[PDB]
Recover the amino acids of this structure.
């Protein structure tokens, strides 16, 4: 590798994406990691690890279909509108994106927002649980897993991804390019002009590859390992359709504590 | 839900 004009431009693109990333996403990985590792003295979050601590934490949890799981999905998808608008605003900063066909812009985003939301949810997760209520609470992984079916199986595949994705130790500089690569995926069904999309992603992939070489000297094949994580992201999104059919076939008890219903609406 | 998201995205792109 050499520091030539082309590498200089790729560093300028990584900086441009990072600055736009910071403007668009107020909840960065660094802020989440500071809370999870206790480095922030300003927002020590409450820990919800069982039904007893859940009812003691009624203070912090701040509060239309009939099925509980459907109402959870409707609510978290409504709560996720601000994230979708932030991802869409970030996409406008990707050089060449707004020049693409408008129908392709909508198609690229409507498939991409789900995978990006899961990527940023991993920043809120460690092996023990996930942050909720804007970092004011901490919901443990095993407590979620212990809830009655089908709710007990909702989040566990996401924790398994998050543990493997966080082991790559990406920072917000890395994530800014990775998010842009996800958006410019030429394989989305219904795309009209795949060629101009891949031309942009080719540029983003070069900028990502150089960023990872500069930022992670002790990671062999980090570029490849990170691209393989997109397979795990896609499978999680795909399995949400299957999760709907599990609900329509469960005639057992589907009632959930109202505080738990509110916590799930802050997830995805 | 899907066209709802497409309309959210269309409005945000304006
Ligand atoms: C919302 C709240 C909680 C969960 N969960 O615990 O699994 C999921 C959701 C949700 O709406 N998830 C979701 C919606 C749409 C798509 C897509 N495409 N993937 C996932």
């Amino acid at each position: 590798g050499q520091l030539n004009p082309e590498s200089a431009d790729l560093r300028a693109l990584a900086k441009h994406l990072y600055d736009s990333y910071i403007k668009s996403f107020p909840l960065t990985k660094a802020k989440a990691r500071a809370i999870l590792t206790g480095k922030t003295t300003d927002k020590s979050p409450f820990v919800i690890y069982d039904m007893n601590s859940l009812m003691m934490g009624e203070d912090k949890i701040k509060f239309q279909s009939k099925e509980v799981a459907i109402r959870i999905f409707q609510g978290c998808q409504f709560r996720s509108v601000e994230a979708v608008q932030e991802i869409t605003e970030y996409a406008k900063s990707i050089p060449g994106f707004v020049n693409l066909d408008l129908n392709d812009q909508v198609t690229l985003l409507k498939y991409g927002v789900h995978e990006i939301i899961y990527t940023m949810l991993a920043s809120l997760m460690n092996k023990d649980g996930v942050l909720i209520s804007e970092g004011q609470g901490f919901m443990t992984r095993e407590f979620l897993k212990s809830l009655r079916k089908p709710f007990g199986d909702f989040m566990e595949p996401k924790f398994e991804f998050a543990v493997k994705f966080n082991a790559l130790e990406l920072d917000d500089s890395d994530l800014a390019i990775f998010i842009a690569v996800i958006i410019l995926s030429g394989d989305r069904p219904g795309l009209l002009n795949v060629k101009p999309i891949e031309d942009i992603q080719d540029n983003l992939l070069q900028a990502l590859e150089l960023q990872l070489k500069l930022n992670h000297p002790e990671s062999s094949q980090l570029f490849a390992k990170l691209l393989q994580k997109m397979t795990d992201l896609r499978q999680i999104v795909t399995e949400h359709v299957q999760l709907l059919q599990v609900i329509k076939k469960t005639e057992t008890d589907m009632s959930l504590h109202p505080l738990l219903q509110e916590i799930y609406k802050d997830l995805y | 839900s899907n066209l709802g998201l497409e309309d959210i995205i269309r409005k945000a792109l304006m």
